[PDB]
Design a protein around this ligand. Structure first.
Ligand SMILES: [Ca+2]
Ligand SMILES: [Ca+2]
Ligand SMILES: [Zn+2]
Ligand SMILES: [Zn+2]
Ligand SMILES: [Zn+2]
Ligand SMILES: [Zn+2]
Lengths: 524, 524
């Protein structure tokens, strides 16, 4: 048999530096993890030992830390080139700075092919981008070749800023003709590498005839065979085996997010390109693996500009930004309004005639707001100031929630009101009235929400059976602060932009901010 | 006696072209008035006939029409130079584009001295601006000399954008030493030319010893001796005679606004520079005076760029901008919210530790909103679109109103509700609740207003005895739409920026707008 070792990352999300165990800022180095310097060490070790290796990325290198804010993808090209990635699929966040912010720097600077078979362009853009990403690439590996066919979430227009020219086609529809073309070219070993989420990955494995392996991303899915090595709880075995409609067993892999793990899958192929066996597991990139000194020194050189940027003025406030717990855990606070307004602004995407914007609503737990910002430093706001407000390295995500779930969340917000607990909700696009004299669970007496399917935005009563898009911290989407109903009842969840970056961009665009307390939250 | 003819304009406010009788856009040419081409004809006629003539401007050439939006003061320098003005005082609106927007183009391009004795600078700005405006200038007139000493409203920091370096001193305090200096230099004929309003002009005439004549502005004051020639009602005789504390009679003049009139005052002086007599009247620049053909042709050449600008995209809306009367004369409408939010943004001025901004509140009669804007032209908004919404050429002014007056205005807003009348108020920084089942005059059941003297803006009940700053159309400050209580009870009133320009600037800054209906106005 011919044995291939697939090394894979996905949803690295700008974690160029090593991180804490929870993928926030590294504080206690002896317990830090990931980063590209440590990844380099492990990849180099494996390449010394195994003859046939591919290093693949399933997208979403863009977005996640100040690295992306400052270097805008140049860090991705540089460090992925240093790691010698063999191929990458486009993720949704590769469109965060528009198609221009993808073409330059990433597509023009990567030394490896960048792939997606289900994105097409028209008009002048089609000529500008032709050949800069590809549906697939056939790569030599030893004396053999392996075809790698890419794909990107069809939902990218709702989850990034690709513009109005690009069209994202159904993944399976686009993939099948490319995989059949590869068969006619005598390519019998085919990896589908792409960025649509574990559920779509399983459908691709089932339905796209000729795919031998699926290497996915987007959903931050952790798969593991055996006892988990850290705190992530597996969603299934690694690999996850799909029985295909052609009657093959097709392994599906993913490797969590944030560069914490290196995916590692060994596949044995017969002479006709059929998978005989597949086995492996993601490797936890913990501190037992040394950071490569050369990569680490280059990381430290690149960090200088980040340190400089972090103390520069982003914009000004003419109001005190009240992020105190005494305010934000007890009543509407103007820091909460600012952050929710920034969240909504970050999620303005292109709209058809059926909505002014696809999402209009925001919730933010007061426990997530960790500092005020004083306006008496000549009004200046810096990144460092924002990092005191939002210190946990999270994202502001998009979910779909039934009205009944959202009502339960607002009841939870005040179920033990008066104790300065973190679950009290700041809001945008929502007007809530509580009556604290009522029993816990029955304190929400009015709950109105901003329409989306309307040409003039206005507030209407929340409807229990209707599904609402809401922007909220990943912490809450994951059930933090007791919001188990959100985790258990949500109907869709996609990871969004970094928390600080969302607020920084809004402040920079607005130039001068003056958020008020304006009656979004009232008490009878 | 030595006879001097003083020709004077003030508060021309970008009326380069002839206007209608009410100083809006000229529609019926046979009834149009003013403009620089017609002014040229009349000034030239007078200079043919009278030996000793000065042509003076008392400030506020900046701001008022698309001319200023596009040419940013270059039109002021060019056409004032063509008219051969002899001197100009700085007005408050000369600071609308900051000190940089005054230095270039006006101070560097004017061929006449520009004056203000009560503005000082410090640090590098002082060196940059030194000598570009002057406290006074001594001008030869025939075989004599006349000193002209300038002044500018001490309130300019609240009424324009001068920045944080310039200091505006009390006018009388600054003027007296300059006038005494002129006496030591054997200058015995002294005109005070400046921009603080008729009330301050009378105080200057009374208290600044050695001033022979005051030529003022700012308050758009119409003075006339005899039957008025048009619709403006005189505030007093022309000249208005002040008895000075030195026991002289000192004439005070002003000439309305908008270039509709040319002020004309003849003064006889004795050999010692004492005024023997003064008489005159503003000259109505009506269509019986031909427009100078050469100036008119140059105006028409300069208009080409204005026509081009008027159809360019200023920014985008993703929402329908509902300026329909069926909405804005009956309930909160999102066009009204947009315009009030633009009004508040235009009035963000520098603030000390005692307020986040000096003004927080806006009212706008629905009768002033004359069109919607549809978002389905790729979201584009142009100046032409805004001119359909705001077609009357007015300004958004600053007033001080007792709470009791503002409550009466809100009662008036709904006193005959249900008839699609123009007085219904759109708002910003105000939350009102009406109960229409109550008697007219007693329908306002809640009225909360955004604080200014606060570091976190929030809403508090309106207080009847407290004085509030409010931004509102000049139409309403003048008692239009039945708001007689505003005209009769206001405690201060200063003219603001052009209505269209206020909204255009806000849209251009915001780039993408999405105003909602959000509960600023509710009905029980
Ligand atoms: Ca195969
Ligand atoms: Ca004198
Ligand atoms: Zn991701
Ligand atoms: Zn993704
Ligand atoms: Zn004026
Ligand atoms: Zn003025």
């Amino acid at each position: 048999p011919w044995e291939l070792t697939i090394l894979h990352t996905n949803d690295v999300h700008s974690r160029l530096e090593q991180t804490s165990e929870d993928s926030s800022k590294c504080v206690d180095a002896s317990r830090c993890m990931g980063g590209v310097a440590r990844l380099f060490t492990k990849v180099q070790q494996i390449r010394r030992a195994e003859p046939n290796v591919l290093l693949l990325d399933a997208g979403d290198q863009y977005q996640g830390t100040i690295w992306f804010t400052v270097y805008k993808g140049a860090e991705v090209a540089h460090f992925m080139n240093a790691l010698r990635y063999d191929a990458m699929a486009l993720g949704n966040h590769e469109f965060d700075n528009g198609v221009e912010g993808l073409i330059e720097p990433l597509l023009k600077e990567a030394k490896f092919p960048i792939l997606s078979a289900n994105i097409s362009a028209s008009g002048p853009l089609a000529s500008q981008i032709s050949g800069l990403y590809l549906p697939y690439k056939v790569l030599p590996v030893g004396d053999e070749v392996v075809g790698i066919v890419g794909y990107t979430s069809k939902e990218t227009p709702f989850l990034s800023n690709p513009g109005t020219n690009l069209v994202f086609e159904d993944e399976i529809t686009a993939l099948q003709p490319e995989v059949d073309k590869l068969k006619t070219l005598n390519v019998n070993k085919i990896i589908a590498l792409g960025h649509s989420g574990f559920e779509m990955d399983k459908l691709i494995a089932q339905k796209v005839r000729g795919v031998d392996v699926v290497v996915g991303g987007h959903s931050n899915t952790f798969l593991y065979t055996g006892n988990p090595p850290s705190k992530e709880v597996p969603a299934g075995k690694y690999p996850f085996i799909v029985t295909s409609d052609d009657g093959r067993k097709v392994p599906v892999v993913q490797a969590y997010a944030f560069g914490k793990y290196l995916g590692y899958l060994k596949i044995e192929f017969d002479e006709r390109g059929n998978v005989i066996s597949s086995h492996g597991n993601p490797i936890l990139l913990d501190s037992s693996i040394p950071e490569d000194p050369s990569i680490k020194a280059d990381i430290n050189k690149w960090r200088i500009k980040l340190d400089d940027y972090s103390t520069q003025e982003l914009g000004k406030t003419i109001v005190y930004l009240d992020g105190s717990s005494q305010s934000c855990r007890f009543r509407e606070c103007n820091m909460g309004n600012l952050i929710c307004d920034a969240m909504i602004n970050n999620n303005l995407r292109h709209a058809d005639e059926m909505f002014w914007n696809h999402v209009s609503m925001c919730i933010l737990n007061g426990g997530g707001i960790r500092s005020p910002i004083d306006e008496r430093n000549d009004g200046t706001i810096t990144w460092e100031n924002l990092a005191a407000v939002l210190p946990f390295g999270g994202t502001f995500d998009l979910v779909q929630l039934k009205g009944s779930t959202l009502k339960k969340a607002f009841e939870h917000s005040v179920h033990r009101y008066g104790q300065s607990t973190g679950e009290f909700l700041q809001v945008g696009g929502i007007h809530v009235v509580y009556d604290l004299s009522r029993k816990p669970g029955d304190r929400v007496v009015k709950l109105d929400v901003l329409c989306t399917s309307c040409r003039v935005p206005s507030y209407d009563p929340l409807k229990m059976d209707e599904v609402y898009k809401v922007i909220l911290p990943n912490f809450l989407a994951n059930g933090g602060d007791g919001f188990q109903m959100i985790k258990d009842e949500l109907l869709r969840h996609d990871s969004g932009d970094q928390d600080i970056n969302v607020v920084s961009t809004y402040i920079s665009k607005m130039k001068v901010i003056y958020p008020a307390v304006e009656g979004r939250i009232k008490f009878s």
